[PDB]
């Protein structure tokens, strides 16, 4: 019984507790504005504050932040634990209903989640594709697409693979014609200073405000830096005190580039988040190791973060302690057979611990092992008690 029932009971780390709070990630397509992202954070706050008013206390929302103009994070607290009874009012069901009604929003990847017990291991991998030969970003992206495509297409071991970095979005490219620049009379320092201060601002000086230092910022007016052809404006004063417009000595075009360039150990890289199919972490890691080997030349792989704590033994700490207790008992009863009769009770309590664990549908967590060893200790406290008198 014990062996079959125990090796067939899955194990996990820790119980995900209702901490009276949870969070909501909001990701939008690359290119959306702050207003259009506030439009979706609007629906987030609407759901949390005006969908079910039984377990919601204060939904602290933030637009343009969370992990790094199209991202957002919704903090939220829950009412007092007494006012939220039953599983239908715990973080699990709340976030389940939330995310289920949330996924129905167009042009938005928004979902809620609970805060895991420890913030370093969390969900049992973190893959890293590495540019080992300087292939470049636009070819490492090809390798990443090749690995991502042939990862979820083999769902017998894994699904829901995704990259951590975000996909490349168009970028505006200016070509400052150096020949035309120095021929018309402008200096490149003036050109680049004007362009950088008109788009992005510049930290120049500081001032005193009510007895405290604050910064000053030279920047364009809002209504003059939100159109492509506005680049043709912003003349510069040059050689014969003449004003030159950018459309006369600069070419403009669209291009492609990465806004979330990731690097690992000092080399270009891209991270991958995924979990094993409802299979252990080891077999999924081995499948990722094989699939990463089926990539173009010069691309490497690495494990980090939520999977580096492993990849470097409870029966190893048990089987020897068992015979150590046996040594103590052999010195106790002045025998070698008699001490066997005490450790003969080891399964007697472990079987019941396993029955109670599989009964409620729970898992062999660290807590279950602690209680298992405690019950083994009490089984010893009883068996030794009997056998001392018997001897």
């Amino acid at each position: 019984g014990m062996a079959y029932l125990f090796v067939r009971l899955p194990s996990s780390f820790l119980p995900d507790e209702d901490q009276g709070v949870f969070m909501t990630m909001v990701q939008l397509p690359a290119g959306a504005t702050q207003e259009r992202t506030q439009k979706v954070l609007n629906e987030v706050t609407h759901y949390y504050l005006t969908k079910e008013k039984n377990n919601v206390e204060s939904v602290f929302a933030v637009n343009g932040f969370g992990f790094a103009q199209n991202t957002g994070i919704a903090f939220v607290s829950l009412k007092d634990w007494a006012d939220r009874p039953g599983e239908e009012n715990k973080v699990e069901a709340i976030t389940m209903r939330a995310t289920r009604a949330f996924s129905q929003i167009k042009d938005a990847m928004v979902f809620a989640f609970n805060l895991p017990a420890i913030v370093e291991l969390g969900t049992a991998f973190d893959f890293e594709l590495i540019d080992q030969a300087g292939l470049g970003h636009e070819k490492l992206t090809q390798a990443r697409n090749q690995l991502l495509a042939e990862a979820a297409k083999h769902p017998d071991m894994l699904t829901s693979v995704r990259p951590n970095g975000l996909e490349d979005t168009p970028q505006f490219k200016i070509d400052i014609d150096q020949e035309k620049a120095q021929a018309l009379g402008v200096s490149i320092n003036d050109i680049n200073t004007t362009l950088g201060a008109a788009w992005g601002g510049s930290y120049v000086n500081d001032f005193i405000d009510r007895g405290r230092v604050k910064k000053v910022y030279v920047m364009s007016e809002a209504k003059y830096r939100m159109l492509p052809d506005d680049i043709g404006d912003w003349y510069v004063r040059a050689a014969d005190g003449q004003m030159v417009p950018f459309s006369a000595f600069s070419s403009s075009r669209w291009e492609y580039g990465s806004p979330r360039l990731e690097r690992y150990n000092g080399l270009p890289s891209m991270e991958i988040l995924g979990q094993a199919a409802p299979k252990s972490t080891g077999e999924a890691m081995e499948l990722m190791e094989q699939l990463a080997s089926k990539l173009p030349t010069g691309v490497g792989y690495d494990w980090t973060g939520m999977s580096y704590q492993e990849r470097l033994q409870a029966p190893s700490l048990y089987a020897i302690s068992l015979i150590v207790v046996f040594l103590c008992l052999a010195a106790l009863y002045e025998s070698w057979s008699i001490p066997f009769s005490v450790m003969l009770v080891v399964p007697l309590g472990v079987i019941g611990a396993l029955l109670a664990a599989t009964f409620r549908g729970l898992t062999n967590d660290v807590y279950f092992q602690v209680g298992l060893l405690t019950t083994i200790g009490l089984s010893a406290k009883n068996a030794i008690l009997i056998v001392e008198f018997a001897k």
Binding site: E17, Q19, G20, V21, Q34, Q38, L41, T45, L49, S58, V59, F60, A61, V62, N63, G64, F65, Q69, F75, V76, S77, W81, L115, D209, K214, K215, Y217, E221, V370, G371, T374
Partner: protein
Amino acid sequence: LKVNQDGSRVLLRDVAKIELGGENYDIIAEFNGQPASGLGIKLNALDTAAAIRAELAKMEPFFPSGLKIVYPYDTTPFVKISIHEVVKTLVEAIILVFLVMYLFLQNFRATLIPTIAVPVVLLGTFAVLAAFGFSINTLTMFGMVL
């Protein structure tokens, strides 16, 4: 700035809007349909948080008319209540053991002997954790009960 020849003044407010604005316009924080601000404290455990519940208690008197403080995301009362519930289960285990002790020994003083032992050893274990530099945490008080 530029001084025109006709005695004309060219200033910065003539060619720019000047305003006491924000340093960065990437982050906006709307609390519950009302605009607000705030700060998150990055990681002691409660002394760290209680020394901010008191460090901010000095700035409440001199706040301008209108400013109010809220705690929208807080994980310190979570542990502060979980550990106290573990202690309540400790006391309930004391009384539930006292019940069986009286059920078997039939005497207040007889069952008083095993009843005194548990709190003595528990306070001693607190002292031992004081010796080994351990902490009253979510997992040790649970061991006190176990």
